[PDB]
Amino acid sequence: MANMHQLLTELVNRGGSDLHLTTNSPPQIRIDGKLLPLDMPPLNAVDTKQLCYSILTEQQKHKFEENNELDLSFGIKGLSRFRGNVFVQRGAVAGVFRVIPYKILSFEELGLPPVVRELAEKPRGLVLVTGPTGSGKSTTLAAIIDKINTDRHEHIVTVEDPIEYLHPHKSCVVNQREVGADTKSFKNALKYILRQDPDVVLVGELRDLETIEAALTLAETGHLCFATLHTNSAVQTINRIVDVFPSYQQPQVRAQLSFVLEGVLSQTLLPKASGTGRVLAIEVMVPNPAIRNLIREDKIHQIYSQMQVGQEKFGMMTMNQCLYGLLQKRHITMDVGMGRSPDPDELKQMLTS
Amino acid sequence: MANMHQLLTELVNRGGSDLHLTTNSPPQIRIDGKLLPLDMPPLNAVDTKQLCYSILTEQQKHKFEENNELDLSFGIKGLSRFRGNVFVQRGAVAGVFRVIPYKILSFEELGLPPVVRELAEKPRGLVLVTGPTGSGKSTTLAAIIDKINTDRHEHIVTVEDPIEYLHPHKSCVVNQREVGADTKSFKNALKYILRQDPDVVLVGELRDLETIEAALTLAETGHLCFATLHTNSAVQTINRIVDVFPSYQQPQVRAQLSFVLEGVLSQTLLPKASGTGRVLAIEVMVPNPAIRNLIREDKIHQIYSQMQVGQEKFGMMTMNQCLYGLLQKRHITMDVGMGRSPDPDELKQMLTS
Numbered sequence: 001m002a003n004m005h006q007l008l009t010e011l012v013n014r015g016g017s018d019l020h021l022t023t024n025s026p027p028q029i030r031i032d033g034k035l036l037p038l039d040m041p042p043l044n045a046v047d048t049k050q051l052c053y054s055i056l057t058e059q060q061k062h063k064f065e066e067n068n069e070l071d072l073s074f075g076i077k078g079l080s081r082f083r084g085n086v087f088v089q090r091g092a093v094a095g096v097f098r099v100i101p102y103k104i105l106s107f108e109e110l111g112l113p114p115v116v117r118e119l120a121e122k123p124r125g126l127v128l129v130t131g132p133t134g135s136g137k138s139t140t141l142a143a144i145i146d147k148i149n150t151d152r153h154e155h156i157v158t159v160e161d162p163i164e165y166l167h168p169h170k171s172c173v174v175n176q177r178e179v180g181a182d183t184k185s186f187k188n189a190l191k192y193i194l195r196q197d198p199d200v201v202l203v204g205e206l207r208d209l210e211t212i213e214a215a216l217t218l219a220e221t222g223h224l225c226f227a228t229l230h231t232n233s234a235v236q237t238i239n240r241i242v243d244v245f246p247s248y249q250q251p252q253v254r255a256q257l258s259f260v261l262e263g264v265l266s267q268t269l270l271p272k273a274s275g276t277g278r279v280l281a282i283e284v285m286v287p288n289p290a291i292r293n294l295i296r297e298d299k300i301h302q303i304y305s306q307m308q309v310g311q312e313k314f315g316m317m318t319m320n321q322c323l324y325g326l327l328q329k330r331h332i333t334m335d336v337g338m339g340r341s342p343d344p345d346e347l348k349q350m351l352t353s
Numbered sequence: 354m355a356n357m358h359q360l361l362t363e364l365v366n367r368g369g370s371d372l373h374l375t376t377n378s379p380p381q382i383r384i385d386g387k388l389l390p391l392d393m394p395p396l397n398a399v400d401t402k403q404l405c406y407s408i409l410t411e412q413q414k415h416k417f418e419e420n421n422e423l424d425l426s427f428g429i430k431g432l433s434r435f436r437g438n439v440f441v442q443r444g445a446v447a448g449v450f451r452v453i454p455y456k457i458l459s460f461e462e463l464g465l466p467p468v469v470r471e472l473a474e475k476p477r478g479l480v481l482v483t484g485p486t487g488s489g490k491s492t493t494l495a496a497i498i499d500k501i502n503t504d505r506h507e508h509i510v511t512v513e514d515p516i517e518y519l520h521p522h523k524s525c526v527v528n529q530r531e532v533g534a535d536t537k538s539f540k541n542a543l544k545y546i547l548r549q550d551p552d553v554v555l556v557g558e559l560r561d562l563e564t565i566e567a568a569l570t571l572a573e574t575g576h577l578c579f580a581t582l583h584t585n586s587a588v589q590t591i592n593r594i595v596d597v598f599p600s601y602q603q604p605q606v607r608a609q610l611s612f613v614l615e616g617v618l619s620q621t622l623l624p625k626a627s628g629t630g631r632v633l634a635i636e637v638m639v640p641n642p643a644i645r646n647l648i649r650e651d652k653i654h655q656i657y658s659q660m661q662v663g664q665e666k667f668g669m670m671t672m673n674q675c676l677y678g679l680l681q682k683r684h685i686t687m688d689v690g691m692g693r694s695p696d697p698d699e700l701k702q703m704l705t706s
């Protein structure tokens with residue numbers, strides 16, 4: 001506890017990105033991508049458990065002991081907030097701890113096209129921000145919420161496991177519920193959200209069926225609902241939503257999605273051509289009447305063709321079209337663009353044309 | 354009357370892998386893959402129970418009597434560590450006991466070519482070590498991991514069922530997770546691995562479609578991912594990964610594999626011609642620009658032709674080329690070499706030439 005503060009302070013003071021605590025090694029900090037041990041004795045299982053437990057609530061200790069996994073965020077007064085992950089290896093506790101910045105970056109700093117700001121102005125519907133873990137999803141969502149919070153006089157409710165970015169009230173009323181402390185579960189929080197007069201709702205990952213129906217219901221009843229998935233493209237995202245349901249109920253889900261879907265953002269971070277930092281590649285799908293019909297008709301695989309010709313009107317963009325632009329601006333190398341293109345032969349064709 | 358400790362000492366001393374205790378047979382030890390009876394009278398039910406129980410705690414004895422099954426590992430201080438499984442057959446106790454080596458062998462001692470040492474230097478991507486059970490896969494991976502641990506300042510995470518080779522921290526931080534104790538399952542470990550700030554991850558077998566997608570994501574997000582399959586050749590490895598996906602998504606998977614694949618090692622252990630020990634036969638495919646294109650163009654068949662002529666530059670090597678070298682050094686018989694050649698007529702032509 002009194003030592004855990006000192007370890008996390010040293011992480012901040014020395015400009016490290018991640019702090020590692022595990023047995024038979026001293027605490028180690030990642031500086032410029034590479035781990036460096038602190039000048040301390042190696043930790044034992046008593047140390048790692050005491051250090052990691054010193055920053056947990058009783059609910060988190062019981063959840064950690066029930067699953068041997070725990071994602072969480074916590075704050076240290078006067079320093080910073082931190083995202084921690086605690087797990088078990090070779091019968092002992094281990095932990096990794098990252099910093100959570102206080103300041104939300106703008107759409108421009110993040111490399112987000114103007115269509116993303118227009119999604120933050122939608123009065124209602126379902127907007128999905130997808131990609132793998134650490135593909136920029138939380139950062140993009142924080143920028144969108146911060147824009148809504150700055151510009152609108154509405155009620156934002158977020159349900160998070162855990163809460164990552166904090167949104168102090170601006171013009172909106174912003175309520176943020178952390179699963180396992182503020183609310184028992186996503187299911188329990190969503191049962192009452194319509195009785196809380198929301199305008200904008202962040203529901204997190206579309207984990208299971210129960211959460212998908214809540215997001216579709218919120219989006220169907222006139223609210224703007226934000227959610228994430230792990231998928232890598234607009235078409236793959238829509239198929240993920242439909243295919244989790246029983247065969248008899250997939251028609252209804254497809255009908256609901258065609259009306260309420262207002263945007264799908266699929267992101268991935270690629271190495272910059274300079275060799276330092278990462279640059280955002282994003283596929284943007286903004287539904288037009290043609291795409292909404294393809295969803296209703298169970299013709300999802302023909303939507304990609306529609307995305308190729310909807311660029312000028314709605315700000316839509318296939319993943320290959322974004323890589324083309326990153327290549328002409330020399331932000332990424334040809335190998336990285338080809339190595340990540342969902343269809344390298346198409347990207348080749350776009351270059352010679 | 355033989356005790357447990359003398360039996361386990363003989364198993365180690367004779368270079369055996371497994372000790373078998375069951376009624377109406379003498380103790381038998383597996384040497385070079387084949388069972389051999391010890392020069393002792395056959396065991397009865399009193400013997401098998403006394404021998405297996407001699408290495409159990411009181412709690413372990415109780416659990417065995419409740420389920421008639423028990424997996425465990427245990428140590429003999431002056432000898433070695435061991436993995437035991439106790440069960441019941443024909444109303445009597447039976448037992449199998451496996452050896453867990455303490456010492457990782459060098460690349461030369463295992464018969465791995467120098468190009469395998471270079472795989473430990475790869476900054477990112479997917480490396481596959483394939484073959485049937487007990488074909489040396491775990492030992493090869495342990496040799497690679499030890500080099501990374503020695504040479505890099507990065508975070509290595511292994512997920513194992515169970516953990517075999519132990520890796521004390523060297524220059525890396527090494528966390529080793531045993532399925533069923535440290536983590537609930539492979540699926541659960543992989544659910545949190547992206548939040549654990551890893552650089553190198555061992556995920557075990559590409560059991561199902563979901564694990565392949567996890568391995569491609571790790572290799573795509575800047576990590577070095579190691580995994581195994583039960584395929585027997587480089588082409589069989591690439592095909593089995595691609596062919597599990599639906600036909601409409603196989604184009605993306607092939608493009609991904611062409612970018613992230615950094616090596617495929619397909620091994621098999623063959624009995625030596627001398628009659629003692631086993632020798633490694635290995636097919637090595639390291640993708641070069643030509644092979645990566647064959648993957649993108651769906652020309653997997655033609656990869657075999659590239660391996661036949663990529664010997665001098667990149668250290669590539671087909672299985673038949675490896676058997677030829679083992680034959681000239683008289684390490685294997687012609688029948689053993691022929692019994693494993695994927696094309697016996699090709700190996701014959703190489704011998705007469």
Ligand SMILES: Nc1ncnc2c1ncn2[C@@H]1O[C@H](COP(=O)(O)OP(=O)(O)O)[C@@H](O)[C@H]1O
Nearest residue numbers: 110111132133134135136137138139140278280
């Ligand atoms: N648009 C972006 N442009 C550049 N870097 C980004 C962008 N979005 C996120 N990042 C960086 O990626 C890292 C983690 O992103 P994160 O928000 O945790 O993604 P996710 O919520 O999907 O896991 C951070 O260091 C962040 O600065």
Ligand SMILES: Nc1ncnc2c1ncn2[C@@H]1O[C@H](COP(=O)(O)OP(=O)(O)O)[C@@H](O)[C@H]1O
Nearest residue numbers: 370463485486487488489490491492493631633
């Ligand atoms: N590269 C190797 N060369 C020679 N013998 C090996 C090699 N790898 C393993 N062995 C021997 O074979 C036995 C079993 O192999 P193992 O490592 O368990 O492969 P797998 O994990 O695929 O089942 C080991 O006890 C070891 O003595």
